[PDB]
Amino acid sequence: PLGTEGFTVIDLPEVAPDILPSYDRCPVDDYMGNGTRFKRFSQYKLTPAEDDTWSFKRLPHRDYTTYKKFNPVGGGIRRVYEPIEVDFTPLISEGIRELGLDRSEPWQINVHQNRTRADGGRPGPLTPEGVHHDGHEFVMIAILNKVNVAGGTTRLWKPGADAPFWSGTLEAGQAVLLDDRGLAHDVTDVLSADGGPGHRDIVIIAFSRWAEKWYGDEHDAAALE
Amino acid sequence: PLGTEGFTVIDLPEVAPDILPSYDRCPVDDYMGNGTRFKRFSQYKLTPAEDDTWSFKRLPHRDYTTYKKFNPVGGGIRRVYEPIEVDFTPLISEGIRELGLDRSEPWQINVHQNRTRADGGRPGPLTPEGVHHDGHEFVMIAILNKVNVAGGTTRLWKPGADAPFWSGTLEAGQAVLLDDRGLAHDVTDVLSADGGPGHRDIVIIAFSRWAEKWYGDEHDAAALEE
Ligand SMILES: [Mg+2]
Ligand SMILES: [Mg+2]
Numbered sequence: 001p002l003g004t005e006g007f008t009v010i011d012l013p014e015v016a017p018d019i020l021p022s023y024d025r026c027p028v029d030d031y032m033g034n035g036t037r038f039k040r041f042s043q044y045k046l047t048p049a050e051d052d053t054w055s056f057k058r059l060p061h062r063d064y065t066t067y068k069k070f071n072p073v074g075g076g077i078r079r080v081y082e083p084i085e086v087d088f089t090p091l092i093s094e095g096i097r098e099l100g101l102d103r104s105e106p107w108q109i110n111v112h113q114n115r116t117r118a119d120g121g122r123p124g125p126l127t128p129e130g131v132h133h134d135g136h137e138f139v140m141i142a143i144l145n146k147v148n149v150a151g152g153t154t155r156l157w158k159p160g161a162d163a164p165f166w167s168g169t170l171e172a173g174q175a176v177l178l179d180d181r182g183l184a185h186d187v188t189d190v191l192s193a194d195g196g197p198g199h200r201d202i203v204i205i206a207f208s209r210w211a212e213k214w215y216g217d218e219h220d221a222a223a224l225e
Numbered sequence: 226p227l228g229t230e231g232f233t234v235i236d237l238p239e240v241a242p243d244i245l246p247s248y249d250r251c252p253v254d255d256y257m258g259n260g261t262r263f264k265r266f267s268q269y270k271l272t273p274a275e276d277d278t279w280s281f282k283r284l285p286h287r288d289y290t291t292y293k294k295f296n297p298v299g300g301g302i303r304r305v306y307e308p309i310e311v312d313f314t315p316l317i318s319e320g321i322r323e324l325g326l327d328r329s330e331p332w333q334i335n336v337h338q339n340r341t342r343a344d345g346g347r348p349g350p351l352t353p354e355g356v357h358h359d360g361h362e363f364v365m366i367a368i369l370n371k372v373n374v375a376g377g378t379t380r381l382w383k384p385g386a387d388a389p390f391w392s393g394t395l396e397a398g399q400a401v402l403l404d405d406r407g408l409a410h411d412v413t414d415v416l417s418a419d420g421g422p423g424h425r426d427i428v429i430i431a432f433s434r435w436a437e438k439w440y441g442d443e444h445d446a447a448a449l450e451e
């Protein structure tokens with residue numbers, strides 16, 4: 001599992017050939033990134049399955065809801081997104097393996113398929129909410145492709161720190177796994193590398209025990225206050 | 226002037242009949258509000274003129290730039306807006322009078338013509354930057370029209386406080402004048418009043434001494450951190 005200071009960076013395996021092209025078919029995110037962001041969203045139930053296997057079950061598609069206390073810019077509202085088309089679960093399995101997720105109860109995950117674009121005039125903001133916790137137990141952020149972009153540096157922060165204790169620009173084929181409770185994080189804006197268009201394609205997976213799931217009417221009611 | 230708490234709420238005079246309709250012709254703000262905000266932007270020089278009067282001069286139109294230290298969501302970038310069509314300067318003069326602006330040097334103002342829309346599913350964020358200072362010496366926020374909205378409550382905060390010391394929902398025909406340095410502010414989201422569409426039309430005027438103007442290549446370099 002995570003290495004003493006509550007995060008690990010891993011290399012990801014090769015991904016199925018449909019995954020990278022699917023980012024072209026993600027519709028604009030109407031709620032975050034002011035036109036720079038494109039998004040699909042699905043939710044899964046994670047159950048331990050026999051000899052060290054985890055099974056994934058796609059849940060009925062629902063609006064995304066989070067708390068303003070975790071995301072003041074995009075929280076407290078129903079965010080209507082389309083489902084993810086492709087299958088990120090083999091990639092996610094790598095994070096489950098590196099986290100060594102507690103097999104003693106089932107888990108629930110949010111899966112964000114995010115493209116952020118940058119251009120000469122206009123960086124692509126990755127965490128306009130700033131330094132923050134997502135509100136879950138664990139978070140996995142995986143980079144699937146970067147084209148003509150600089151910046152996009154992940155920074156990890158201890159509670160109350162004036163400066164991050166760790167920084168690193170995650171590249172295509174890398175993922176960071178983090179204790180989303182013990183650590184906060186932000187990420188610097190995506191910058192156009194040469195003045196022309198560029199983009200950064202990622203997946204964010206937020207892990208919560210099913211008993212604390214971010215799914216259903218009770219969660220929605222709480223997140224929307 | 227403002228008075229000991231660093232803010233005052235004033236009533237505004239009647240406005241010319243072109244002001245309220247002009248809000249229907251503000252294009253979408255591409256940089257803030259995620260489609261809920263519509264905006265035009267102009268900058269003026271304010272000079273002390275004879276007879277205890279103030280002269281307004283509209284400056285050559287330039288992209289808006291502000292600092293990330295004041296606006297982390299919309300700071301540090303060139304924001305290309307279209308100029309304001311109508312003339313807010315009579316309304317601004319009510320603010321200058323109430324502020325008692327220091328006549329000993331000229332001033333420069335940023336003028337933001339803002340419409341925020343709310344709908345049943347979708348509140349209209351007014352200060353997604355959160356509690357903040359705009360970075361200027363004084364700020365005037367005037368409400369020109371509210372249609373079918375709730376929320377939109379202005380909250381004023383002492384530096385570093387964990388709760389605001391004053392709150393008020395400003396209505397059409399009201400303006401708040403504030404010490405943008407000694408106080409921070411935020412505003413609660415615009416809410417649909419009945420489930421249908423609604424909107425809130427305002428102008429924000431940020432006052433800075435000309436010697437510290439938020440205009441021109443040097444300000445831009447500083448705000449963009451170039
Ligand atoms: Mg998003
Ligand atoms: Mg944005």
Ligand SMILES: [Mg+2]
Nearest residue numbers: 114125126127
């Ligand atoms: Mg992002």
Ligand SMILES: [Mg+2]
Nearest residue numbers: 066070134135
């Ligand atoms: Mg969240």
Ligand SMILES: [Mg+2]
Nearest residue numbers: 257258298353
């Ligand atoms: Mg915004």
Ligand SMILES: [Mg+2]
Nearest residue numbers: 291296299300
């Ligand atoms: Mg601003």
Ligand SMILES: [Mg+2]
Nearest residue numbers: 339350351352
């Ligand atoms: Mg506003």
Ligand SMILES: [Mg+2]
Nearest residue numbers: 291295359360
């Ligand atoms: Mg500002």
